Amino acid sequence: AAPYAAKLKQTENDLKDIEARIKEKAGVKESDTGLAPSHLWDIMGDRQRLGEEH
């Protein structure tokens, strides 16, 4: 099945890149809640975090 069989292996070898790429893309990934205006909320909510009312 020579003409087809060669491509079939080469497809498997290709797949091995797709897994590796998912792991490198996820190695350096960041995540947020609420971004830029709640950087400001850190200044304020850190003074109020020291107290007890929670």
CA distance 47 to 33: 20
Q: Which residue is it, tokens 């205006």?
A: 37
Of 1, 9, 12, 29, the residue at the interface with another protein (CB under 8 A) is: 29
User: Under the criterion CB under 8 A, does residue 42 sit at the interface with another protein?
Assistant: yes
User: Under the criterion CB under 8 A, does residue 5 sit at the interface with another protein?
Assistant: no
Own/partner pairs, 12-16, CB within 8 angstroms, 24+ separation: none
Token pair belonging to 7: 């491509």
What residues make contact with another protein under the rule CB under 8 A? 3-4, 7, 10-11, 14, 17-18, 20-21, 24-34, 38-39, 41-42, 44-46, 48-49, 52-54
